[PDB]
Amino acid sequence: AKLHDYYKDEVVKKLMTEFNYNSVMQVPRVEKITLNMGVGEAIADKKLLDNAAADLAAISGQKPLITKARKSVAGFKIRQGYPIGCKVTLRGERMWEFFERLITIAVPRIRDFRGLSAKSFDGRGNYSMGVREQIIFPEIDYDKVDRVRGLDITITTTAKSDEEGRALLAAFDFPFR
Amino acid sequence: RNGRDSEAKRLGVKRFGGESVLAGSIIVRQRGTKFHAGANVGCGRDHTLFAKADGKVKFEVKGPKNRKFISIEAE
Amino acid sequence: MKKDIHPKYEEITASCSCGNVMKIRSTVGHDLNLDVCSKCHPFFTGKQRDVATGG
Amino acid sequence: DKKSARIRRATRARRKLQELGATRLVVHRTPRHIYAQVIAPNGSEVLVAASTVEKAIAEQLKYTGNKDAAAAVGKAVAERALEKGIKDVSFDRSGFQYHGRVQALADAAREAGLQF
Amino acid sequence: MLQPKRTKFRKMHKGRNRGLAQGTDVSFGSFGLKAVGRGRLTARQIEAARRAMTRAVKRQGKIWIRVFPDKPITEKPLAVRMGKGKGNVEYWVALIQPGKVLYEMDGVPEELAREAFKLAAAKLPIKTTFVTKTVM
Amino acid sequence: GIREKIKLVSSAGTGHFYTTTKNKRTKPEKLELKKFDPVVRQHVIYKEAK
RNA sequence: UAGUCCGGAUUGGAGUCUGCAACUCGACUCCAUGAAGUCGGAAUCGCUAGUAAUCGUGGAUCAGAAUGCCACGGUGAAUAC
RNA sequence: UCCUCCUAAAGAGUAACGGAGGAGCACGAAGGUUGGCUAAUCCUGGUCGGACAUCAGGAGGUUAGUGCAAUGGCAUAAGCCAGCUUGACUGCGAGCGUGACGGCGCGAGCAGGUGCGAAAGCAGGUCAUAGUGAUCCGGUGGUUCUGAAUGGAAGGGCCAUC
RNA sequence: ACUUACCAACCCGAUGCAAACUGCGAAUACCGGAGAAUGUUAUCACGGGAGACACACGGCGGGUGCUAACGUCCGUC
RNA sequence: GCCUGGCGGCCGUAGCGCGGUGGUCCCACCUGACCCCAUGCCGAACUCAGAAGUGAAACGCCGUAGCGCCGAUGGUAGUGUGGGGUCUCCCCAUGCGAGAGUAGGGAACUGCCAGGCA
RNA sequence: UGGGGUAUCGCCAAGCGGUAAGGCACCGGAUUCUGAUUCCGGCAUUCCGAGGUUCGAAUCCUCGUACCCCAGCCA
């Protein structure tokens, strides 16, 4: 709720100032933050996907939803309805708390941190990034890791254009190399 | 390599428009719901449409998809 | 949220070497020691020493 | 679309009740009102209607759009419907879950004598 | 020789060749070789006639073959009885009716189009005529 | 084909049985179905996946 | 008792000396890196006593360049029916 | 032998050693009901991650799906997911369709008992059309219906069934 | 990373073909209802007796054949 | 009379797209969620308690024909009956008569009930 | 022309739809004055070509190619 209050005064005010909106509700707001961990090496092992699920359970504060295969493809030796990833849809209060931990303490603990790419918008403002280690979150115990498992974050927001998402995210200072 | 066909199933419209029916009479023995059930018409398990009340057969075209209903006018 | 299927997500206090005492909710279940925060991380000095190579 | 999803949830029971030919009590829940109207078996003409936008109902309520308001509306539709000779209807929940204040409205219509 | 790359069924019924044609105006080019007789045209006759045209008006010009075979004709071998299945697909014909512009040509004078269309109409089995591109 | 024939016998004292077919290989468990018993005239539990 | 405080190859940086001149193409030093290798398949070699084994030192050639060659000593076996 | 399309001439039917394909099952959930949901494919962004495994957004519109061929159907979904379940009931059945017949099919409703649903209601298997075999002879369970003097029994019948 | 007489998806414009293609769609035929005239009930049901179940050509619609056959297989007259 | 909401008739002359406008009420987004209830994670949806804020999105209304859609008249194709030929195809008398295309029409029309404004 | 069979390392020959096994050869080392024999190590065919079913093809289906076997008759 720290960055939610910071949103409600200074990001709403700041973006009403920058872009010449009329409505106070036309301003972009971040809808949700989805944390995917598409493990894929669970074609042979179930405890590996269980450990992946424990890691997203630690990084967010929620149980993950173990996702199944939509189509069967033979390129990767999977089958229809076989469990192959896990995700957490963070929204509401926990979106802002995770977003605070993310841009505050998790992003600086990235190895060789140069900055987050500004051209990682999908055309509709929705950011998506990938971390390569789960170690960069302070909850994951470094002595209890077995496999290095990155994950991909996706900030989904209500902006129409992607420069409008540059503005929204950049008003949280959200590093942007 | 050929030379086979099934026995002809005798589908189609058994009672036409304006034709007086008893209750229970089969109107259209058919295969999907080419014709849908309307007022006082039932649809059997093999999509056979049968007269559920007495009257006269009424073929109509209803609804947003231009479906072909079959009503029965009470008569 | 549902009942107890989720991990215990209790408010803790993180503190780094920058003097940034910051209380947050995290499901570690333990108070935290850090080094780098968003305040006083070598991001801009890092970009400067990155560009500053040639000659 | 939320409204269109609701209408396609409604449609099966709507067409089934038009097929049986029963007078239906159509409910309609909005975030600050509930609407209830008794509709003839031809589907075109209404008979009885009460809702929280009527000041006869709205003045005696704290807030239109909660379970007390909906119970008031169900009582009103049952009273007016019994005054106009209608006894036995079929409840068209109109795409909402029979849970919250549509359950309060329909229970209130069953207490006050309307047969379904 | 022209033949569809990939059919849907290998053997077609005979059927009949009645009525008039659909391709009737000189559409693409400027001069046209239009059918008058009914008949049908194998792929060898279309190829023969096209070589007569392409030779005749040399590698200048531009020629459109407006008909395409797409109809398989089956024959039974020699000393085979009747019955015992349908024959085998030997060639492919196009069915022609009176009015089909069989070929078009553009980028030549009219007198060479007369000449190539004479040269190539003597490789076809149907009575044929010369047409021009009429404007509406 | 592979799918065998079994008798669902009645749990009441009657000898009345329904009859049906079971895949014996994939479902080796017995089959209990509360069916209708017309001698008792009542819905009784039926057993005996043969 | 660990590929480890074994092993030092390889490589980056910084140097000293000789020599007109160390890029091809020296030697040595300092910091960093830290491979392969855990006793070697078929096969094969040397040694009978101050010997083998092992440890250092010197010299010739040479401005500078030896793990080679030629010498010198220290410790010092086993076994031969 | 059976199913689907065409031939087949816009009702039905219609032949050939005519053109093309399939069946001789599966399922105790893949059936019943209630509540909900909506595909293929492509584009963009994104850790390993790749033309194609997961995530997010957009275009798109059912080009998808339907346990298995093809045709006709399907959004109110007949498609997809979950809760509870056994109506994959028993006796009948107005009326029809379809066959030379044997036979086959559709069926509102009535009675008894049941499931789901708050209720209206829906449920006598599955989206439909294939998944099959008359009679005799005989096997197993039930029912005194018969039971060659009489009481039983044997055998026979009837119902279920192999 | 730099050039290119070669091919080409999708999309758009224009042109054809289809028994097993259809966002269209006749004539006819068929089913049902009413009405007039005409017809030796021509109609239906039930009962006695059959015969026949090798068809042929000709028109029209087709399959097969080579739009061959006084060919073959259907539909209808 | 104008506007809005519900349930229908009708099923593209009714749908799309582009542009403008609406919020007093209504509607929608919204605010919050410990409770009723819910998520194979998540109050996103469902649900509940509300009403601060905005009509941005949505939805409605008003324009606009770029498209979809409707669509004559005439001619053409086909075809029933009778006749004819040069007869694998056509012609004549006669009855029916398209599909496509053209001119054009065209951004709906309407019933019941309820509420707000005049 | 029909029916059947085969095509897999340089050669002969095994392969079960989720991996390519054997022998001879070849390559390197060793033994030997040198070669043969011998001994120690290796490698190795993405499976005749094209299309399709499948998540996946050497494997299953269809077509083409090349080579074998059987039949191609009564008059």
Curated annotation (Swiss-Prot), chain A:
Cellular component GO terms, alphabetical: cytoplasm; cytosol; cytosolic large ribosomal subunit
GO BP of this protein: cytoplasmic translation; ribosomal large subunit assembly; translation
Sequence similarity: Belongs to the universal ribosomal protein uL5 family.
Residues with the N6-acetyllysine modification: 2
UniProt miscellaneous comment: Identified as a multicopy suppressor of the slow growth phenotype of an rsgA (yjeQ) deletion mutant.
Keywords associated with the record: Acetylation, Ribonucleoprotein, Ribosomal protein, RNA-binding, rRNA-binding, tRNA-binding
GO function terms (MF aspect): 5S rRNA binding; RNA binding; structural constituent of ribosome; tRNA binding
InterPro entries hit by this protein: Ribosomal_uL5 (IPR002132), Ribosomal_uL5_bac-type (IPR020930), Ribosomal_uL5_C (IPR031309), Ribosomal_uL5_CS (IPR020929), Ribosomal_uL5_dom_sf (IPR022803), Ribosomal_uL5_N (IPR031310)
Protein name (Swiss-Prot/TrEMBL): Large ribosomal subunit protein uL5
Keyword Protease assigned: no
Keyword Isomerase in annotation: no
Assembly mode: Part of the 50S ribosomal subunit; part of the 5S rRNA/L5/L18/L25 subcomplex. Contacts the 5S rRNA; cross-links to the P site tRNA. Forms a bridge to the 30S subunit in the 70S ribosome, contacting protein S13 and S19.
Domain of life where this protein originates: Bacteria
Physiological role: This is one of the proteins that bind and probably mediate the attachment of the 5S RNA into the large ribosomal subunit, where it forms part of the central protuberance. Its 5S rRNA binding is significantly enhanced in the presence of L18.
Coiled-coil regions, chain positions: none
Species per Swiss-Prot/TrEMBL record: Escherichia coli (strain K12)
Curated annotation (Swiss-Prot), chain D:
Annotated region described as Required for binding of the 5S rRNA/L5/L18 complex to the 23S rRNA, given as residue ranges: 1-16
GO terms for MF: 5S rRNA binding; structural constituent of ribosome
Keyword match Transferase: no
Keyword Membrane assigned: no
Pfam family, one: Ribosomal_L18p
GO annotation, biological process: cytoplasmic translation
Entries under CDD domains matching the protein: Ribosomal_L18_L5e
Highest taxon of source: Bacteria
GO cellular component, one term: cytosol
PTM note: The protein has been shown to contain a phosphoserine, which was required for the protein to bind to 5S rRNA. However, the presence of this phosphoserine is controversial, and it has not been seen by mass spectrometry.
Cleaved signal peptide residues: none
Keywords: Phosphoprotein, Ribonucleoprotein, Ribosomal protein, RNA-binding, rRNA-binding
Gene3D superfamilies for the chain: 3.30.420.100
Function: This is one of the proteins that mediates the attachment of the 5S rRNA subcomplex onto the large ribosomal subunit where it forms part of the central protuberance. Binds stably to 5S rRNA; increases binding abilities of L5 in a cooperative fashion; both proteins together confer 23S rRNA binding. The 5S rRNA and some of its associated proteins might help stabilize positioning of ribosome-bound tRNAs.
Family per similarity comment: Belongs to the universal ribosomal protein uL18 family.
Domain notes per entry: The basic N-terminus is not necessary for binding to 5S rRNA. It is however required for cooperative binding of L5 and L18 to 5S rRNA as well as for binding of the 5S rRNA/L5/L18 complex to the 23S rRNA.
Record note on quaternary structure: Part of the 50S ribosomal subunit; part of the 5S rRNA/L5/L18/L25 subcomplex. Contacts the 5S and 23S rRNAs.
Protein's name in the database: Large ribosomal subunit protein uL18
Gene assigned in the entry: rplR
Swiss-Prot record, chain E:
Keyword tags: Hydroxylation, Methylation, Ribonucleoprotein, Ribosomal protein, RNA-binding, rRNA-binding, tRNA-binding
Post-translational modification comment from the UniProt entry: Is hydroxylated on Arg-81 by RoxA. The modification is nearly suppressed when E.coli is grown in anoxia.
Residues with the (3R)-3-hydroxyarginine modification: 81
GO CC field: cytoplasm; cytosolic large ribosomal subunit
InterPro entries: Ribosomal_uL16 (IPR047873), Ribosomal_uL16_bact-type (IPR000114), Ribosomal_uL16_CS (IPR020798), Ribosomal_uL16_dom (IPR016180), Ribosomal_uL16_sf (IPR036920)
Residues modified as N-methylmethionine: 1
SUPFAM superfamilies: Ribosomal protein L16p/L10e (SSF54686)
Example of a GO MF term: tRNA binding
Domain of life: Bacteria
GO biological process entries: cytoplasmic translation; ribosomal large subunit assembly
Pfam families attached to this UniProt entry: Ribosomal_L16 (PF00252)
Free-text function comment from the UniProt entry: Binds directly to 23S ribosomal RNA and is located at the A site of the peptidyltransferase center. It contacts the A and P site tRNAs. One of the last ribosomal proteins to be assembled in the 50S subunit. The simultaneous presence of uL16 and bL36 probably triggers ObgE's GTPase activity and eventual dissociation from the mature 50S ribosmal subunit. It has an essential role in subunit assembly.
Family annotation (PANTHER family): 50S/60S RIBOSOMAL PROTEIN L16, LARGE RIBOSOMAL SUBUNIT PROTEIN UL16M
Subunit and partners: Part of the 50S ribosomal subunit. Cross-links to the A and P site tRNAs. Interacts with assembly factor DarP(YjgA).
Family note: Belongs to the universal ribosomal protein uL16 family.
Protein name as it appears in the record: Large ribosomal subunit protein uL16
Name of the coding gene: rplP
Swiss-Prot record, chain F:
A GO molecular function held by the record: tRNA binding
Annotated keywords: Methylation, Ribonucleoprotein, Ribosomal protein, RNA-binding, tRNA-binding
UniProt KW RNA-binding keyword: yes
Highest taxon, organism lineage: Bacteria
Record flagged with keyword Glycoprotein: no
One of the protein's GO biological processes: response to antibiotic
NCBIfam families (alphabetical): PRK00595.1, rpmG_bact
Remarks, miscellaneous: Surface exposed on the 50S subunit.
Matches recorded under PANTHER family: 54S RIBOSOMAL PROTEIN L39, MITOCHONDRIAL, LARGE RIBOSOMAL SUBUNIT PROTEIN BL33M
Family per similarity comment: Belongs to the bacterial ribosomal protein bL33 family.
Protein name (Swiss-Prot/TrEMBL): Large ribosomal subunit protein bL33
Organism: Escherichia coli (strain K12)
